Ligand binder design. Sequence first.
Ligand SMILES: *SC[C@H](NC(=O)CC[C@H](N)C(=O)O)C(=O)NCC(=O)O
Ligand SMILES: *SC[C@H](NC(=O)CC[C@H](N)C(=O)O)C(=O)NCC(=O)O
Lengths: 238, 238
Amino acid sequence: SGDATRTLGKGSQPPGPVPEGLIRIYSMRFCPYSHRTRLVLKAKDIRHEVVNINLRNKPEWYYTKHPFGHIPVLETSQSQLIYESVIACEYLDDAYPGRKLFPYDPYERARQKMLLELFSKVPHLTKECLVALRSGRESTNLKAALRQEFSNLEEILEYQNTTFFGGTSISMIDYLLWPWFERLDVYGILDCVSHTPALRLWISAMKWDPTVSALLMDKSIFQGFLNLYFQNNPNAFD
Amino acid sequence: SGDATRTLGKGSQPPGPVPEGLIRIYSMRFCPYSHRTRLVLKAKDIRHEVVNINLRNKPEWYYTKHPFGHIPVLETSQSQLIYESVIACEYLDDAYPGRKLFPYDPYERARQKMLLELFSKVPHLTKECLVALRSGRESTNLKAALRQEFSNLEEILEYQNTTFFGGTSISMIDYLLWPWFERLDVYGILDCVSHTPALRLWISAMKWDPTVSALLMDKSIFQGFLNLYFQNNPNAFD
Ligand SMILES: *SC[C@H](NC(=O)CC[C@H](N)C(=O)O)C(=O)NCC(=O)O
Ligand SMILES: *SC[C@H](NC(=O)CC[C@H](N)C(=O)O)C(=O)NCC(=O)O
């Protein structure tokens, strides 16, 4: 919600300076790391501007935002740059008022970061699973590894006996995990959660969250992206 | 300072419960990750107990502190477990009063975490360098890679024109990086900072810090450790 604009690529005008009272995020519509920070921006009700970046043909000026041209990057009114999706999310939460997403209790807050670490293998595994399916490979081994990681997550929800990873209602950790879980269906690996019932309840509960729901990707647009993407078609990155 | 005790290994008595008003850290005298958390414990003047763990022959009960028996682990009076050195350090800083090690400003705090990420390749590279030297390998390539990482760090200090990574005086980020820098000499890779003058000034400045100085390892004990270690001698882990 609010990121439906053409990407800027090589030869594009850099945006103006960030206006006072706004923060800016450099994103890309299909990037799960950027998705994570956009969820936090929305959930916290932060006034912001989304600038999409062309990852195949990056604007030369974009390397002045991140030395390797990665996304997400946050850029403030005072010229300050913040990156790593997790560092970005955490900064957003501390810097801005209203709803607090991380717990106040130091221990509870640490627990969520520990849960974040337990999840660390999932992003690259889902990616490897996708790449395998998209080349026609019998990706039984990667799926088996993903299922294990998801079993590790299931045991947390199951032990805590709460709907969300951080308790009875949604919080920071839930948004941090969300984007890869949204992608399972289109990735073709929704079956990797067939054995994890609390994860499946969590997925349902997440979709009902105002913020999660507002930012849900259109499934058919996303399928088109993946087709162009795996053909290395420049149109994917627009 | 305060970690000069025999390690507990297989068949060892587990320690009692953590007494009210104390936090406990599971460590090992030569572990750089644990060293990081001990520096924070000391710097914050936190009342604590250090329990050393035998990494070659782990106590069976230790898997009830960390599922893979890693260190450091913090254990509280209320039975709570916190791990990952960085998560531990961060929790310590938020939970305990007096001197604050991370900056108060959200942006400045985020910057330090960004500096921590820039440093991320250094631990395993220094380890690979050590392993290479200790088997008699012409480790020119690993040293070249380490030197690059150290050049990346030098440019930060140089751009900021301050002694410490977080400013004119010592702070959290400095303690987080410290342990690998202490180890360069005994590792045999002190020459990998020959080209980085602010890093070398920083190293000198760090050694003068009350906390850093208090926890400095004895060089000859450490050489003995490495000899036993690379011989897979059980005595290394005592
Ligand atoms: S989704 C696009 C890529 N983003 C990242 O992999 C950021 C990961 C960070 N670790 C994080 O923010 O958490 C991306 O920037 N791809 C462009 C590239 O050239 O790598
Ligand atoms: S120094 C001993 C080892 N510790 C770690 O590698 C912890 C690293 C974490 N990422 C961190 O705390 O930052 C260790 O626990 N070795 C024992 C083993 O069997 O791996």
